[PDB]
Amino acid sequence: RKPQNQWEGVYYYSGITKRQRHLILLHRKREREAHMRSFNISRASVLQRLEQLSGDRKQESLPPHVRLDLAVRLAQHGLYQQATPIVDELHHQKALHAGHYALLINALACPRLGQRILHCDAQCDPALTYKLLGDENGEERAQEAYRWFDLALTSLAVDCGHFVPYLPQGTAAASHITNALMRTLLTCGYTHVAAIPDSVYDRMGSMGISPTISTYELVMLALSLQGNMVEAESILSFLRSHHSEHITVESFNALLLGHREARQFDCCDAIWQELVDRRWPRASPLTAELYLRSIMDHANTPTSEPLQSFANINVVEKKKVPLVLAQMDELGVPRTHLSRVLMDEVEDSLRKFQTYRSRFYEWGRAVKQFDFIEFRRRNGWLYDLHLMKGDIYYDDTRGLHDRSPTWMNEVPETRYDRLYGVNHPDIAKIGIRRHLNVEYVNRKEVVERDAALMKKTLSSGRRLRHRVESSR
Amino acid sequence: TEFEKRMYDIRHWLHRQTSCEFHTIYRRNVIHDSAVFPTEHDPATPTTHEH
Amino acid sequence: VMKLAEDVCMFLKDVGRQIVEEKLVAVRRLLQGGAVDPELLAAFNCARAGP
């Protein structure tokens, strides 16, 4: 029988229809418009509250906490220019204190515009939120954060008026305000992100402010967004050497995001395996988000060493996705806490590489294989990548033939059958009978039949030779 | 599991007319629950061969 | 089978060295320093009477 191919895979369905992809795109567009509508409604409510407090309260002076909450809600929605005269008035009235300055600088990083940029603009890539929040006035919000940092340090020097030459630089409030400054400067453009471990960290050292774990995590995240991995791994090695009981998961998220940005995915796998090994600090859904996005970025990466001779090579890394998801079921990380775009890619890689036992008993039926062949024959112009177009180390002088008796054990059946007439002058050396040299199953009978036929034709040839040479 | 996945896919590039089977001996924690399976005294009326 | 066992052993050597190096780079980070899991600490203090 014709042989079947054992290196050809079983035909199975791994893909979606054009209608299902169109409905996925339509539903994701609807979710993006819903998030945009929610942010615009909240921003309109905040601006209406500001216009109410500016119009109706023209001469009636408000309490300072209402103005502080209004400035916080204005800065959180990306309206920083409408909040800075409120902060100037509150600082001029000396109503702001140590926590209120850090609250204002943390609100200057706009964590309500960031949610809209996350769900609509960045398509839920958390590094792209930092990359896209620098467009909405990065340098101006950075200058306002530096100005509010100077205001905060002046008010901390006022509020601390022994340890007298070491105040307010030795207090917790200076470190909290510096952490708020770094967290706000991460939101801005690339210049301030690069200046976080360069200028801000050296200024915090020269001022004599003792850092905390959030300081090192924000410096690691700034170096992650820069793409400098040896310095971020050096900072985590410093934290592992000295202050190891204080390390939280944000440093692991910084390294995952940074090795994803530097496109060193083996380091992403190493960091994820280390986080699964130690199990403390606990893996957030941001860990699974960053690791699965690094997997999807590596799997969609085209290679150039085989030059795409047969197919794309990196797609087999999507086979890592049904493993790591199971690890999430051991880590207590809920898989429903993943974004919709990443969930679409994870279900893509799951329907490409996952099967159950009940399907594995039925997936090789000839009906499904021939339906696969018929569906490729009828409409393969819709789904095809090409249709779009002794010991050797102590051996040196080897001892041969050491009187090991091969006659104690039994190997007597070493019979071989050679073809008839190897040195015969009448039998030709070249011939089709050379094809008899490669035949194993019926070897003995074929050699005996060939020898009998050759003996018979040589005997008949010499008989005819004698009869003709004697007849004349 | 990264190695077990890589070990199972040797079956897709094997030689001609050459198959394989896999053996796995791994360590697994077993809990003996002393409340589901308690250690109690023998009953007053014991069991016999007729049971 | 002898030529296959040279093809698979060379395959599992390079794969198995890459996986153990991925585990060795994690173990040497776990030995430099880390924080004790509170669930791991609760597992040691679980018995009523100790030794």
Binding site: N5, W7, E8, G9, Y11, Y12, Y13, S14, G15, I16, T17, Q20, F310, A311, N312, V315, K352, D371, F372, F375, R376, G380, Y383, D384, L385, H386, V438, Y440 | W13, H15, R16, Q17, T18 | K3, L4
Partner: peptide, 30 residues
């Protein structure tokens, strides 16, 4: 016609058919 047994029994060429053709799931049963 066949492959001889003293020849090296390597794989001749790999086949990427499920990654060239991505088929949606279609059964006759609902």
């Amino acid at each position: 016609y066949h492959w001889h047994y003293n020849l090296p029994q390597g794989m001749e060429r790999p086949h990427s058919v499920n990654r060239t053709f991505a088929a949606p799931f279609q059964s006759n049963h609902s």
